[PDB]
Amino acid sequence: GSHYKQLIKNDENITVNESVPRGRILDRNGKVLVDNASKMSITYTRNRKTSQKEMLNTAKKLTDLIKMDTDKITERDKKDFWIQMYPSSAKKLMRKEQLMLEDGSISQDQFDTQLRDKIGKKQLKQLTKKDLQVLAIYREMNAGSTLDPQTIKNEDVSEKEYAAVSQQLSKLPGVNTTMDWDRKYPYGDTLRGIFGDVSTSTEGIPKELTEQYLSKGYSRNDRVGKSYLEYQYEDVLKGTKKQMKYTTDKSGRVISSEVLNPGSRGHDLQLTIDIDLQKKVESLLEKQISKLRSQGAKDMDNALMVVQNPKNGDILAIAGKQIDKQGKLKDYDIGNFTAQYTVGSSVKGGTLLAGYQNKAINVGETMVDEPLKFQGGLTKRSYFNKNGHVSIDDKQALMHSSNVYMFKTALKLAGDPYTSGMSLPNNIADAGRKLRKGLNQVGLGLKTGIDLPNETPGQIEPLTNNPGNYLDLAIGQYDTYTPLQLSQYVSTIANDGYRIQPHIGLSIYESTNKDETGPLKRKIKGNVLNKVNNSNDEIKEVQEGFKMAFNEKQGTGYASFRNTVVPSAGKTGTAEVFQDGEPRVNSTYIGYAPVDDPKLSFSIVYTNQPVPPPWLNGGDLGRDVINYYFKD
């Protein structure tokens, strides 16, 4: 599959370069996810004056070396072909018309049309199985002349057919055989969007990516990584090409050969993905989408889940689907870091940490949850307590998902603690920057740093004199976020305040030999981006609230998470949105397990569920992933 692609001259001094095979991509257990497969083609080249009777002889020689699909043969092909495949039949067909042509009373055109109008009935079926074989090669040999090469066979070129034809090129004028490599995907559709694509050789480096690939020393004939993993790890997955140099003189005789570089295959790239976990998640996600639709969520259009190991940032799984009104799924794994959503209450753990670090609230501070009244008549209240007055902890705020605790916390951060009937503070610019700085430190707002292109950090709108938006940011209902951000954030809680870069790459192998990993080259680490600016008591208080949400009778997550095979903890979020001016919610979920020494963390996002008086338990998808992963 070694195409050249360079021949550089100098001192009567050619340097030719030969391409090398691409590195594989394996999962964390070694299972091949992306491989190379060989593809052969049989090609012809049509000359200035190669006859119609010559190509009919080269084709007949070929039907003994290859088998041919007899599609593509039009009836004009069969009709035309039948004329040579019995001249004295066609001469019996045009008895009269031949004399008119000889008298010059009809032209060759008229004659031709009249003959090709003159059979299709019983005596077109005169074409044997082998005749159609030579016609299927003939039809491809007249595609569009000049030295451009038409392909005869592309798919199902067997190696037997490839060897037979290659060793007969001396008896087959214009016939040629090529060999080329394509990516092969043992697991089908799974993660194809994360894996990405290489250019198709006919493509070369794509126009949009060019100049960038040329500033590194590559050629426009080269095949290169176009998107996502193939692009990100392009220069570890590409080989070192075989570079030959020759020294020649007078008319062309080489007087010295010198192998500049023998070549090496690309390095194998091993990912953090566990493809068995990945398939199990995709299976549960599909069943959960279908169950939620059966319970009324037939406008829900996105469902995304990220599964991480919070101690090192490893992405163990990453799945997303888009859902049309009929339940049909379109794969969208990349939505976890390229798409942003209003996530609602699940951010409140970050809000509390921002409150503590600016001394706006104390660990364990109790406040009264109740409807708040602001100037002119604007009210704000917590879902669990629309009509009453309850004194609650910060960890009971997380358990209940108290809006009003976070509102009071944000006004304290704004230097304007709540009093009934107050007017909202006029300039919240400084409070807004302080609240975002707190959320940034757990991954809410900045790019997480994933080793894939196109990560978005979410839509971040100005906070100057819009205190209503500012209070909303404290409950996840202003700036938007990616599921990976949600996941980085809950992982920072799970691992005691260390915000780690998520990564899907895990290691790079100095692969030399076919189908053998070879020694380890380099590791791909989830680096620590920062530690949260909070004490150990402060982090443990959010952790305690998260455990209470999943395990106390009144936690919003009690229904889905109280019975996990190991103890789990996390936070739910619900945000009121609109679609085509109809009311909807987004539902989010974050969590980790086991509580005591977390080894797995996750985020889940559903968009445009029905507004709940019936509360759907889409968190069950998280309960099921936890239960599967800790089966043994």
* Catalytic residue IDs: 345
Q: Is the dihedral of CA 381, 386, 390, 393 positive or negative?
A: negative
- DSSP string computed for 567-627: --EEEEEEEEEEETTEEEEEEEEEEEE-SSS--EEEEEEEEEEPPSSS---TTHHHHHHHH
Strands 25-26 and 268-271: parallel
Strands 15-18 and 505-509: unpaired
Q: Which of 196, 200, 205 is nearest to 228 (CA)?
A: 196
Q: How far apart are CA 606 and CA 20, in angstroms?
A: 44
Structure tokens that stand for 199 in this block: 């250019």
> What is the spatial distance between Cα 240 and Cα 21, in angstroms, rounded to a whole number?
9
377: left (phi over 0), alpha (psi -120 to 50) or beta: left
CA distance 623 to 612: 20
Structure tokens at 501: 């870069």
d(CA 355, CA 328): 43
Whole-number Å distance between alpha carbons of 305 and 332 = 11
> How far apart are alpha carbons 100 and 88 in whole angstroms?
18
Spatial neighbors of 87 by CB under 8 A, at least 6 apart, are none
C-beta separation of 549 from 571 below 8 A: yes
User: How far is C-alpha 238 from the chain's CA centre?
Assistant: 20
The conformation of residue 346, written as its DSSP 8-state character, comes to: G
CA–CA dist 272, 256 (Å, integer): 48
Contacting residues for 41 by C-beta, under 8 A, at least 6 apart: 151, 152, 153, 154, 157, 177, 178, 180
Which two three-digit tokens encode residue 604?
Answer: 């889940």
- At residue 439, φ and ψ (nearest 5 deg) are -70, -40
Locate 15 and state its tokens.
């340097």
How far is Cα 193 from Cα 450, in angstroms, rounded to an integer?
A: 15
CB 321 within 8 A of CB 330: yes
**β-sheet bridge partners, residue 25:** 34, 269
